[PDB]
Design a protein around this motif. Structure first.
Motif, short mmCIF file in Angstrom:
data_model
loop_
_atom_site.label_atom_id
_atom_site.label_comp_id
_atom_site.label_asym_id
_atom_site.label_seq_id
_atom_site.Cartn_x
_atom_site.Cartn_y
_atom_site.Cartn_z
N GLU A 7 0.83 -1.20 0.00
CA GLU A 7 0.00 0.00 0.00
C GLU A 7 0.87 1.25 0.00
OE1 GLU A 7 -3.58 -0.93 2.42
OE2 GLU A 7 -2.13 -1.73 3.86
N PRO A 8 0.69 2.16 -0.95
CA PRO A 8 1.49 3.39 -0.94
C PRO A 8 1.08 4.31 0.20
CG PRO A 8 -0.20 3.54 -2.61
CD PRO A 8 -0.29 2.15 -2.04
N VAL A 9 2.03 5.15 0.62
CA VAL A 9 1.82 6.10 1.70
C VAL A 9 1.97 7.50 1.14
CG1 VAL A 9 4.07 5.18 2.35
CG2 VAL A 9 3.15 7.16 3.57
N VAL A 61 -2.95 9.56 7.90
CA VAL A 61 -2.60 9.19 9.26
C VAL A 61 -2.82 7.69 9.40
CG1 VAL A 61 -3.41 9.25 11.64
CG2 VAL A 61 -2.92 11.38 10.43
N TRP A 62 -1.77 6.98 9.80
CA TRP A 62 -1.83 5.53 9.91
C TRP A 62 -2.02 5.11 11.36
CZ3 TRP A 62 0.46 1.85 5.97
CH2 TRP A 62 0.47 2.44 4.70
N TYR A 63 -2.25 3.82 11.56
CA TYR A 63 -2.35 3.23 12.89
C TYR A 63 -1.12 2.36 13.12
CZ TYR A 63 -5.02 2.15 17.08
OH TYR A 63 -5.47 2.07 18.38
N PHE A 64 -0.37 2.66 14.17
CA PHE A 64 0.87 1.97 14.47
C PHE A 64 0.64 1.02 15.63
CE2 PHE A 64 5.46 2.16 16.06
CZ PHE A 64 5.83 1.14 15.22
N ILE A 65 0.93 -0.27 15.40
CA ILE A 65 0.85 -1.31 16.41
C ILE A 65 2.18 -2.05 16.42
CG2 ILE A 65 -0.26 -3.44 17.14
CD1 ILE A 65 -2.71 -2.14 15.34
N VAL A 115 -0.41 7.55 14.08
CA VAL A 115 0.82 8.24 13.72
C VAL A 115 0.56 9.08 12.47
CG1 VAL A 115 2.58 6.84 14.82
CG2 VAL A 115 1.50 6.04 12.72
N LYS A 116 0.96 10.34 12.52
CA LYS A 116 0.82 11.26 11.40
C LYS A 116 2.16 11.43 10.71
CE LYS A 116 -2.44 13.81 14.23
NZ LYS A 116 -3.03 15.15 14.47
N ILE A 169 9.86 6.35 6.72
CA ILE A 169 8.78 7.27 7.07
C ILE A 169 9.01 7.78 8.49
CG2 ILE A 169 6.32 7.56 7.40
CD1 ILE A 169 6.67 4.80 5.32
N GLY A 170 8.87 9.09 8.68
CA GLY A 170 9.12 9.73 9.96
C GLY A 170 7.86 10.30 10.58
N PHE A 171 7.85 10.35 11.91
CA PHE A 171 6.76 10.94 12.67
C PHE A 171 7.33 11.71 13.85
CE2 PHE A 171 4.14 7.82 10.48
CZ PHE A 171 4.95 6.71 10.45
N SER A 172 6.59 12.75 14.25
CA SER A 172 6.93 13.57 15.42
C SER A 172 8.33 14.16 15.27
CB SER A 172 6.80 12.76 16.71
OG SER A 172 7.99 12.04 16.99
N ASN A 173 8.46 15.04 14.27
CA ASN A 173 9.69 15.75 13.94
C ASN A 173 10.83 14.78 13.63
OD1 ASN A 173 12.08 15.91 16.03
ND2 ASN A 173 10.22 15.81 17.28
N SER A 174 12.02 15.32 13.35
CA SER A 174 13.11 14.54 12.79
C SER A 174 14.28 14.45 13.76
CB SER A 174 13.59 15.14 11.46
OG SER A 174 14.04 16.47 11.64
#
Lengths: 126, 272
Positions: A31-33, A38-42, A52-53, A70-75
């Motif tokens: 699946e492309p992103v 906003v995805w669901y991280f488990i 996760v955005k 793929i990054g989340f919550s700044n770098s």
């Protein structure tokens, strides 16, 4: 500002009271992103079950077989970012001192007119 | 009897005919080097295959050289080395399968001197495209007198195969073992002459090439690989930049927006 509520909100904006975290995921699904979804991280071993955005994507060509990052919550920290921050602060300081040189010269310039006023008044008083 | 034919500088040379003392004993071909682009996720079983690809392989020919005397042996060895090793790649094929040819580069092979006048050799040609192609393109007629086609080239023995069409809807048969895609450095040419604004649709593949200008019968539209031209003039800015591809077997083509269509396909068959 002069009131206290604006100072309070400014002070609240001025500090960070939570740990600064940055999340990076190596994704190899079909699946492309996109840049907005906003995805669901488990992830049970790391104790993650949240939403996760996406804030950063490093994608490869669809024929390149490589993973996606793929990054989340700044770098992450990195040095080139620090150098850019230092350079922009240097530029801001340079423009500030360039402006204040002219401001001080004007302060000298604004003095002579008032000196003339004082001299004229002294002559008039005599 | 076995022999090896080399196409070099537009000339066909028989290895045995060129060197009388050299005779080809046997030919052989390494199997296609299939390679799946594996991706591994730690903790899981096996791999996730990507897109299967084919690596370059080797075509071998065992031969022997029988000279009259020692100076003749040395001269023949030097002349064979001069003939085989060229600056650029050339074409080779064999008597056993004279309908399939390979674009190859030679490999270093040393003569094994057995006696004062005889020497065994095992020439190896690296084929780097990863596939073999027919000696003739699709434009060549499927007639006996052309002396190009042989058995085993996946020619359909149930219906006629022509690659020039006069109507707006037809079928084209790609007999190769690979989907013909110019993006994969495949050879594919389309020459169409018609009147109006054309649009070519490959229904089986689902592709579509669109040209956004009026065309007359006197102007030929030529798509070679990934270049569309009219009268040998690049008009890529006026197209949709789409490219058609030929799937294995039959492809249903439909042409819209023009009349009195005359479209011809010119491509070689890709074997393996």
């Amino acid at each position: 500002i002069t009131n206290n509520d604006d100072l309070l909100i400014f002070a609240k904006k001025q500090i960070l009271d939570v740990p600064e975290t940055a999340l990076t995921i190596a994704y190899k699904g079909k699946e492309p992103v996109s840049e907005r979804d906003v995805w669901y991280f488990i992830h049970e071993p790391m104790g993650f079950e949240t939403e996760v955005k996406v804030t950063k994507i490093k994608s490869s060509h669809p024929w390149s077989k490589k993973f996606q990052e793929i990054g989340f919550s700044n770098s992450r920290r990195d040095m080139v970012r620090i150098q850019t921050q230092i350079a922009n602060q240097v530029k801001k300081a340079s423009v500030d001192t360039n402006k204040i040189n002219s401001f001080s010269s004007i302060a000298m310039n604004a003095y002579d007119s008032r000196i003339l006023t004082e001299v004229v008044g002294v002559v008039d008083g005599d | 009897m076995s022999d090896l034919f080399l196409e070099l500088n537009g000339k066909v040379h028989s290895l045995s005919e060129t060197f009388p003392g050299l005779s080809v004993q046997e030919v052989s071909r390494q199997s296609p080097q299939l390679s799946m682009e594996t991706a591994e996720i730690a903790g899981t079983d096996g791999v996730i295959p990507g897109m299967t690809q084919f690596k370059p392989f080797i075509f071998s020919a065992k031969c022997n050289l029988q000279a009259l005397d020692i100076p003749d042996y040395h001269l023949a060895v030097r002349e064979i080395y001069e003939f085989l090793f060229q600056r650029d790649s050339y074409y080779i094929w064999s008597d056993q399968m004279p309908g399939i040819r390979y674009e190859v580069h030679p490999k270093p092979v040393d003569f094994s001197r057995e006696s004062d006048r005889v020497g065994l050799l095992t020439i190896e040609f690296d084929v780097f495209k990863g596939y073999a192609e027919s000696r003739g393109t699709s434009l060549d007629p499927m007639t006996f007198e052309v002396d190009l086609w042989q058995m085993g080239m996946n020619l359909s023995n149930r219906d006629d195969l022509f690659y020039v069409f006069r109507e707006n809807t037809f079928r084209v048969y790609n007999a190769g073992s690979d989907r013909v895609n110019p993006l994969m450095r495949h050879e594919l040419d389309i020459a169409m002459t018609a009147n109006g604004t054309p649009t070519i649709h490959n229904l089986t593949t689902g592709e579509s090439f669109e040209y956004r200008k009026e065309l007359q019968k006197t102007d030929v539209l030529l798509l070679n690989n990934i270049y569309p031209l009219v009268n040998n003039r690049r008009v890529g800015k006026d197209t949709n930049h789409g490219i058609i591809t030929l799937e294995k077997g039959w492809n249903d083509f439909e042409i819209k927006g023009v009349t009195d269509v005359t479209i011809a396909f010119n491509f070689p068959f890709i074997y393996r």
